[PDB]
């Protein structure tokens, strides 16, 4: 019913307005999208493109950028940072 994000990810979620430490999958996804939207990490022209270099999100993902259209790297980071 819920997962616990490891610290690095929990800080990012909190910065997007998340409260607590236990969340559902969709909850994690919601705050993560709000983090990206708020900090405007996506490109204005190609909005599926997210540049995270120089942001803690990029340090956690192990990448300077990713595409929401090919989420594999995103899901790989979540499997490594979410505990059931």
């Amino acid at each position: 019913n819920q997962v616990r994000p490891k610290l690095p990810l929990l800080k990012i979620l909190h910065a997007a307005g998340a409260q607590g430490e236990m969340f559902t999958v969709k909850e994690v996804m919601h705050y993560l999208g709000q983090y990206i939207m708020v900090k405007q990490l996506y490109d204005q022209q190609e909005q599926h493109m997210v540049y995270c270099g120089g942001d803690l999100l990029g340090e956690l993902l192990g990448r300077q950028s990713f595409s929401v259209k090919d989420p594999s790297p995103l899901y790989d980071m979540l499997r490594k940072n979410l505990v059931t």
Partner: peptide, 12 residues
């Protein structure tokens, strides 16, 4: 599409 459109449909 917009960022919201793409993101809201991850895992769908």
């Amino acid at each position: 599409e917009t960022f919201e459109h793409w993101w809201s449909q991850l895992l769908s």
